[PDB]
Design a protein around this nucleic acid. Structure first.
Ligand code: MG
Ligand code: MG
Ligand code: MG
Ligand code: MG
Ligand code: MG
Ligand code: MG
Ligand code: MG
Ligand code: MG
Ligand code: MG
Ligand code: MG
Ligand code: MG
Ligand code: MG
Ligand code: MG
Ligand code: MG
Ligand code: MG
Ligand code: MG
Ligand code: MG
Ligand code: MG
Ligand code: MG
Ligand code: MG
Ligand code: MG
Ligand code: MG
Ligand code: MG
Ligand code: MG
Ligand code: MG
Ligand code: MG
Ligand code: MG
Ligand code: MG
Ligand code: MG
Ligand code: MG
Ligand code: MG
Ligand code: MG
Ligand code: MG
Ligand code: MG
Ligand code: MG
Ligand code: MG
Ligand code: MG
Ligand code: MG
Ligand code: MG
Ligand code: MG
Ligand code: MG
Ligand code: MG
Ligand code: MG
Ligand code: MG
Ligand code: MG
Ligand code: MG
Ligand code: MG
Ligand code: MG
Ligand code: MG
Ligand code: MG
Ligand code: MG
Ligand code: MG
Ligand code: MG
Ligand code: MG
Ligand code: MG
Ligand code: MG
Ligand code: MG
Ligand code: MG
Ligand code: MG
Ligand code: MG
Ligand code: MG
Ligand code: MG
Ligand code: MG
Ligand code: MG
Ligand code: MG
Ligand code: MG
Ligand code: MG
Ligand code: MG
Ligand code: MG
Ligand code: MG
Ligand code: MG
Ligand code: MG
Ligand code: MG
Ligand code: MG
Ligand code: MG
Ligand code: MG
Ligand code: MG
Ligand code: MG
Ligand code: MG
Ligand code: MG
Ligand code: MG
Ligand code: MG
Ligand code: MG
Ligand code: MG
Ligand code: MG
Ligand code: MG
Ligand code: MG
Ligand code: MG
Ligand code: MG
Ligand code: MG
Ligand code: MG
Ligand code: MG
Ligand code: MG
Ligand code: MG
Ligand code: MG
Ligand code: MG
Ligand code: MG
Ligand code: MG
Ligand code: MG
Ligand code: MG
Ligand code: MG
Ligand code: MG
Lengths: 56, 65, 119, 123
RNA sequence: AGGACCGAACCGACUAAUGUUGAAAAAUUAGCGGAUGACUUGUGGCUGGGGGUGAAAGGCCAAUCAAACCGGGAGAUAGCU
RNA sequence: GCUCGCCGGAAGACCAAGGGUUCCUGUCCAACGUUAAUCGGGGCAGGGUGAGUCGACCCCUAAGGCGAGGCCGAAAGGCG
RNA sequence: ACACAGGUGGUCAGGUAGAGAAUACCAAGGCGCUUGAGAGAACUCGGGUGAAGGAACUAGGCAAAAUGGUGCCGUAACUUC
RNA sequence: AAUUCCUUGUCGGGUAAGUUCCGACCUGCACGAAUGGCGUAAUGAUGGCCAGGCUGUCUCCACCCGAGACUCAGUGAAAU
RNA sequence: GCUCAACGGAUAAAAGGUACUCCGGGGAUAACAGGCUGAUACCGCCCAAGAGUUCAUAUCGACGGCGGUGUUUGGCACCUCGAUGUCGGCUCAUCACAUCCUGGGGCUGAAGUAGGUCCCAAGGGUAUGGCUGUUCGCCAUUUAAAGUGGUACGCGAGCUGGGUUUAGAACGUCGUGAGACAGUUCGGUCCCUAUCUGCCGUGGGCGCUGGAGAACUGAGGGGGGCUGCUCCUAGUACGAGAGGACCGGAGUGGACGCAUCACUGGUGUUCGGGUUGUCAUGCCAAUGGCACUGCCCGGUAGCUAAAUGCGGAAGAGAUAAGUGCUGAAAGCAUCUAAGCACGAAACUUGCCCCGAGAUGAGUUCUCCCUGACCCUUUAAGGGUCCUGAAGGAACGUUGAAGACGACGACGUUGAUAGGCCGGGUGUGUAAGCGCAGCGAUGCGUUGAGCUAACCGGUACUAAUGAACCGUGAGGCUUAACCU
């Protein structure tokens, strides 16, 4: 249920090969407010695809 | 076959128990007394000879009387 | 396996999901826009929008049905007075889902579910 | 769907009321018996004087099951009780002379022609 | 009337599953036995280690008991590791 | 704030034990809180406990403890 | 040892159904148990239902299932009555 | 036989089939009379056996509901 | 002046128990397993006295002889006593052939049927129960058969804990006693989140020599491989009869496997209803909450088995034992030495699945990019600007796809999901009102209302204008060509 030897910092770094984060690829710029948001999300000031979908 | 009872592991692995099945008659014996089957086979062949000569001398004392 | 199945479970037993979606449909009717997670908002559409299709016929029966779905007289008196003739001509799709980012407390995908004819 | 340890009712005047299936004949590893399947049974309850005695071991043929039989159209004939008609072990022909209750069309053959020719209702 | 019957609190722990770096150095859950008595419980008091106490299992005596705990003799001795 | 759910011979209210400022208010978020925290039984600062009748003290004794003298025991002490 | 599924003596005892302080839903009153959000694989844990058969399971009917209340009729060997 | 080595004694019953069980037998290895014998109604979370109902125990597993698992965000052990 | 005799004499003077146990140590030394050996065991073989009416070798085979296996009981004490955790069952297996079944044969004291024994053959198959903790065994009924063994007498970091093998108790027996017993009997804690190898799945990374999308050949690997009963040939061959076939053909079964949900069903806490208790909605009415979904009754989709479809084969090649043909060596004989033919569930194909990471990285079809410069250390060199293709990926709507990834459908030129509309289906005559009834209720409106996942439709909602990645004609040497 346990190791018999100490795994090296080589085997430890190899396991963390796939722990790397995937950075955001596209930040769509809103066409009216001109502020950046996530593609298919509303902005931080309540715009989405031009119109003001929700007030602040 | 393995013996069955107390005594521990040494019972539990070694067979040391011999059953002998006499084919043309059908008298069987199951001696299990020692811890070695060689003392348990000859002291089981000693019993069948004492249970076949005890089976014709019993047969020659029914059709005698 | 959930082949051809439908309905979310939301880590909740049956008598809680029916109560929570009642407390939530009775709040989307009152304020016309609420803020909730995105998996809870895609399953409230399946609750609220049959209560506005139930609102397109102002009978004594449908008042008594829509009080069995909401148990709130103020909601039923908004569904049939106000939201009834508001969506009297839309063929479904009475609501709108607006993804609004991620919550600070548990990183949940939040969303705004709102009514269509609101502003 | 008769298996072993199954109490069956009796569908003739052979002299038993209640028998128990102790083997399903007709193949190694064979689980169940439909109708028209030869099973070996023992007699758990008999009338005080009849052709068979309590504790006898003899064959039977299953005439009625509660799981029923499916006809080729998809239709199925389910009864309310498992039944059987006792046989002889060697000749393998029925013992009683007056079959009780209905039987089905799956029982008639060159083997069990006598049983369907003695039963009241052949569904 | 009752070391009477059924059964909650109350006291106990018969089976099973869980748990076994647990929620817990012995418990939980569902069933279980006593439940006016040789019952249970509170607060105080007494019995001290070869001694106590024991409806008696070598049981209990502060998670410790075929002889407690802490201080000393004491850096016991160890043909053994 | 509006709903919803839970317990209700308790998961309510109030004593004694025990704890010892945890109570209350203003303030603060490093640590502490099994996450975060503007919140806390956490940090800092101030406040709060009012009795002829309640409880203790007091008066009375139970077990049991101490024990003038006394009896006993190498000494310590033991019993009374 | 912890903001620990344990343990801690006494007092108060409402409604409806019920014999009851069982128990269900409630009141007064107090809480939602201090990580959440999704997903709806194996597998495990705790539960629900089951065709035909009904102890073939197994060391063993273990576990589950079932029986369950009141009033009345009725009730065997045996017995220390 | 809570006791019997040979022993699954033998015979009967029970079961399709019974090293257990119950009834006899007596050849009691090695019972036996207050380290008590033989009975014994009631009682037993007592040991063994049979029958009835009942059933996922099983044939032979299916499906479902919740809590884990699983992914994401936060915190973050252990034996070795 | 000591049998101090345990005789170089521990003292003149010395028995036991521990399963309540404890410590120091040992694999220096036992029980388990491994190992070495093979006495024994098991299996072959050699001689053939005999048995077999006569006839050693159809079948057994005395007296003796030689080996094999490691397989029983042992022997030795080499590995482990700073732990190698144990019998039986369960669950998975896996190999061996010394074959239980099925297959192919030789001999038979083989009429046939059916046996006998030997040889070849490991492909698949190789019961359920009663008793017992049982392995083992006996028994019941089956079966084509209920194989023998190896794998720590396979398998407890998978399960069980009956037996043994602790502490309690009792009996018999032994002991004066503590206690004892390969004697029984009642009771008695089985722990571990997987680092590595392993294995089952499934991804990411790069490689495959320009990039990308598809379709592929198949080096190889895996799966699969069971078999009865009836009928026909034919009551013919055979036989005094009784009995009863070879070969070949047909049906229909069992167990197993793969698939699927149309059927019969199962579930269906997301559908409909009945109902009890209580609380609430101002009350009646109607509903709702909670009581395991409160208890039930049904039940759509899905998933499923008990449901119903298919599967094993046939063939072919080469064969094993075997049967031969021609045929010498050896004027004959002879299956072999040359040459040739048949010959099995075995072997190779045939059948389904995986499969170019097959680095030996393959083949075919399609698509896409045809800019400028410099720099020095001229090289598969480095930089700048311009450029950004095919395509991919992200995001979103999602799925009869899925743990996550992946896979698939879809993104307004849109049916991808929800909704909506229509139907289907399920529940079984909704509420409100009217009447009949003293009332509970019944009747009518009304097969009504409600109806999840289904089916067919419909842009109503959400699937954005984009942006990001990936680029600029792809090395060298020969060779065949090309004008
Ligand atoms: Mg090591
Ligand atoms: Mg990782
Ligand atoms: Mg012993
Ligand atoms: Mg051994
Ligand atoms: Mg769907
Ligand atoms: Mg969760
Ligand atoms: Mg509920
Ligand atoms: Mg009493
Ligand atoms: Mg006690
Ligand atoms: Mg309990
Ligand atoms: Mg009682
Ligand atoms: Mg203690
Ligand atoms: Mg002491
Ligand atoms: Mg001492
Ligand atoms: Mg000293
Ligand atoms: Mg020292
Ligand atoms: Mg409640
Ligand atoms: Mg309280
Ligand atoms: Mg403080
Ligand atoms: Mg406070
Ligand atoms: Mg404060
Ligand atoms: Mg902070
Ligand atoms: Mg914090
Ligand atoms: Mg404070
Ligand atoms: Mg006073
Ligand atoms: Mg006094
Ligand atoms: Mg004095
Ligand atoms: Mg005194
Ligand atoms: Mg806490
Ligand atoms: Mg009450
Ligand atoms: Mg209660
Ligand atoms: Mg689940
Ligand atoms: Mg159901
Ligand atoms: Mg059930
Ligand atoms: Mg069933
Ligand atoms: Mg049924
Ligand atoms: Mg059994
Ligand atoms: Mg069994
Ligand atoms: Mg039970
Ligand atoms: Mg129950
Ligand atoms: Mg008998
Ligand atoms: Mg007797
Ligand atoms: Mg005796
Ligand atoms: Mg005695
Ligand atoms: Mg006497
Ligand atoms: Mg005596
Ligand atoms: Mg006595
Ligand atoms: Mg008692
Ligand atoms: Mg039985
Ligand atoms: Mg000496
Ligand atoms: Mg000497
Ligand atoms: Mg003792
Ligand atoms: Mg030791
Ligand atoms: Mg050694
Ligand atoms: Mg050994
Ligand atoms: Mg050897
Ligand atoms: Mg030898
Ligand atoms: Mg001859
Ligand atoms: Mg020979
Ligand atoms: Mg010889
Ligand atoms: Mg070996
Ligand atoms: Mg050996
Ligand atoms: Mg070793
Ligand atoms: Mg060792
Ligand atoms: Mg070690
Ligand atoms: Mg061979
Ligand atoms: Mg032959
Ligand atoms: Mg095989
Ligand atoms: Mg069996
Ligand atoms: Mg048994
Ligand atoms: Mg084996
Ligand atoms: Mg061996
Ligand atoms: Mg083993
Ligand atoms: Mg094992
Ligand atoms: Mg045991
Ligand atoms: Mg003992
Ligand atoms: Mg990959
Ligand atoms: Mg292959
Ligand atoms: Mg179907
Ligand atoms: Mg369908
Ligand atoms: Mg159905
Ligand atoms: Mg279905
Ligand atoms: Mg109600
Ligand atoms: Mg009402
Ligand atoms: Mg409530
Ligand atoms: Mg149903
Ligand atoms: Mg072939
Ligand atoms: Mg050939
Ligand atoms: Mg040949
Ligand atoms: Mg010739
Ligand atoms: Mg010639
Ligand atoms: Mg075949
Ligand atoms: Mg082959
Ligand atoms: Mg269209
Ligand atoms: Mg749609
Ligand atoms: Mg319909
Ligand atoms: Mg009508
Ligand atoms: Mg209704
Ligand atoms: Mg009506
Ligand atoms: Mg309908
Ligand atoms: Mg509809
Ligand atoms: Mg559609």
């Amino acid at each position: 249920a346990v190791q018999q030897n100490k795994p090296t910092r080589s085997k430890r770094g190899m396991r963390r090969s796939h722990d790397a984060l995937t950075a955001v690829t596209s930040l769509s710029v809103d066409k009216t407010s001109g502020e950046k948001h996530l593609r298919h999300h509303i902005t931080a000031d309540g715009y989405y695809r031009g119109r003001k979908v929700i007030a602040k | 076959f393995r013996s069955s009872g107390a005594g521990g592991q040494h019972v539990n692995t070694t067979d040391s128990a011999i059953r002998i099945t006499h084919l043309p008659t059908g008298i069987v014996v199951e001696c299990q007394d020692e811890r070695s089957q060689h003392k348990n086979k000859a002291k089981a062949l000693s019993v069948l000879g004492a249970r076949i000569h005890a089976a014709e001398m019993a047969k020659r004392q029914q059709a005698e009387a | 396996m959930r082949h051809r199945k439908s309905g979310r479970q939301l880590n909740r037993n049956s008598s809680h999901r029916q109560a929570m979606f009642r407390n939530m449909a009775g709040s989307l009717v009152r304020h016309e826009i609420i803020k909730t997670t995105l998996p809870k908002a895609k399953e409230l559409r399946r609750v609220v929008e049959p209560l506005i299709t139930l609102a397109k016929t102002d009978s004594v029966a449908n008042r008594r049905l829509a009080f069995a779905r909401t148990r709130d007289n103020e909601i039923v008196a908004k569904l049939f007075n106000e939201l009834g003739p508001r969506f009297a001509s839309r063929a479904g799709g009475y609501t709108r889902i607006l993804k609004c980012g991620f919550r600070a407390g548990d990183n949940a995908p939040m969303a705004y579910i709102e009514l269509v004819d609101r502003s | 769907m008769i298996q072993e340890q199954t109490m069956l009712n009796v569908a003739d005047n052979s002299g038993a009321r209640r028998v128990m299936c102790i083997k399903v004949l007709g193949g190694s590893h064979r689980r169940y018996a439909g109708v028209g399947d030869i099973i070996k049974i023992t007699i758990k309850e008999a009338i005080p004087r009849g052709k068979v005695k309590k504790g006898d071991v003899l064959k039977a043929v299953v005439v009625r099951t509660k799981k029923g039989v499916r006809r080729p159209d998809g239709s199925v004939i389910r009864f309310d009780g498992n039944a059987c008609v006792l046989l002889n072990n060697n000749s393998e022909q029925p013992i009683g002379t007056r079959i009780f209750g209905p039987v089905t069309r799956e029982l008639r053959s060159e083997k069990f022609m006598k049983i369907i020719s003695l039963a009241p209702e052949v569904l």
